[PDB]
C-alpha cells in the first residue's frame, strides 16, 4: 500500500528506528532544538499518530510503516530525485523531492523498496517493486507538466562547457552569448536554448548505493526537462578519453529507462 504523512510524523517515526537523518535530498531536518521543544514535539506527534492509526495503544509505530521508514533512511541502492521548478509568483519556492530507495539483503531476488514523495509540508511512502522501468519512469514524472517527448534528434556537448555555460547564464551573461560559446549547430540551438532557459522545470536524478560500509554516489546526473517543445533528456557518459559528455535527447520514457539503467551501471552493482 501507501501511506501519506507529514514530516513531523515521518520525523518521529524516523527518530523510532533510530535514524540520525533522512536522506539529504527529501530535505527533512529536525523541527526542533532544545529538550522542551522535543517535548512538545513528541507529545504532538504520538497524538497525532495516535489517532490517525499508526501508533497502537500500547504505544508502537505500525511495523510495515516504520520499515518503510527503514527503508529510506538506510538504503543498500537507492536514486535520489530533485525536482526543480516555476516559482510560486508571490516569490516562493515549494519543495518537490523524491527518493527511490531499495533494501535488499536477503529476498521475498525480488528488490522490494519504497519511494518516498516530499512536498511541501507533506510526504508520501510508497511500497513496489522497481524491477520494471514501466513502473518506475511515470513516478518520477510527476512532478513535471508531463509534456509529451519534444521532437528533435539527439545531439552532445562536453559536460565541462554546458555546466560553465549554465553558469554564466547564472551570473549575468546573456543567453545570445553563452549559446554562441557552447558551438551548437544551428538546428540544435532551440532545444538548448529552451533547455537553459524559458519555464525551466526539470528533475535531477542521482544514482546511489551502499557497498559494506562505504557509500558510493555517480560524479555526474542525469536531467529530465519540459520544454515548451516538449520533454528533453539530458544523459552523461563517457566518451573513448573519458571525457564527460552531456547528451541532448528526445524525452521518451525508454530512452529515460535506458539512460537510468545506464547511470546506475556506473555503480558496484
Known amino acids: 500500500n501507501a501511506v501519506e504523512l507529514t514530516v513531523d510524523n515521518a520525523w518521529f517515526i524516523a527518530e523510532t528506528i533510530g535514524a540520525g537523518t533522512f536522506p539529504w535530498v527529501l530535505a527533512i531536518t529536525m523541527p526542533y532544538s532544545d529538550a522542551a521543544q522535543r ?34 533512511c538506510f538504503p543498500d541502492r537507492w536514486l535520489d530525485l530533485r525536482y526543480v521548478g516555476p516559482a510560486s509568483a508571490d516569490g516562493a519556492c515549494e519543495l518537490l523531492r523524491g527518493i527511490v530507495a ?14 518516498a514523495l516530499r512536498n511541501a509540508q507533506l510526504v508520501t511512502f510508497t511500497a513496489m517493486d522497481i524491477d520494471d522501468p514501466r513502473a518506475l519512469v511515470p513516478i518520477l514524472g510527476v512532478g513535471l507538466a508531463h509534456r509529451p517527448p519534444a521532437r528533435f534528434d539527439e545531439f552532445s556537448l562536453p ?111
Open 39 to 72: 517535548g512538545a514535539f513528541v507529545d504532538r506527534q504520538r497524538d497525532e499518530l495516535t489517532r490517525m492509526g499508526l501508533l497502537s495503544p500500547q504505544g508502537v509505530i505500525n511495523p510495515a510503516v516504520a520499515d518503510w521508514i527503514k527503508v529510506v
Open 102 to 115: 531499495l533494501r535488499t539483503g536477503t529476498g521475498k531476488k525480488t528488490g522490494n523498496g519504497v519511494v
Open 159 to 269: 559536460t565541462r562547457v554546458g555546466a560553465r555555460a549554465d553558469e554564466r547564464l547564472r551570473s549575468g551573461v546573456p543567453l545570445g552569448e553563452v549559446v554562441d560559446y557552447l558551438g551548437i549547430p544551428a538546428s540544435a540551438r532551440p532545444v538548448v536554448e529552451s533547455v537553459f532557459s524559458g519555464p525551466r522545470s526539470y528533475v535531477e536524478i542521482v544514482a546511489g548505493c551502499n557497498r559494506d560500509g562505504r557509500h558510493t554516489t555517480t560524479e555526474v546526473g542525469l536531467s529530465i526537462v519540459d520544454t515548451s517543445a516538449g520533454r528533453v533528456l539530458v544523459s552523461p557518459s563517457r566518451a573513448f578519453d573519458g571525457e564527460w559528455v552531456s547528451t541532448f535527447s528526445p524525452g521518451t520514457p525508454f530512452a529515460i529507462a535506458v539512460a537510468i539503467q545506464t547511470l546506475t551501471a556506473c555503480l558496484p552493482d
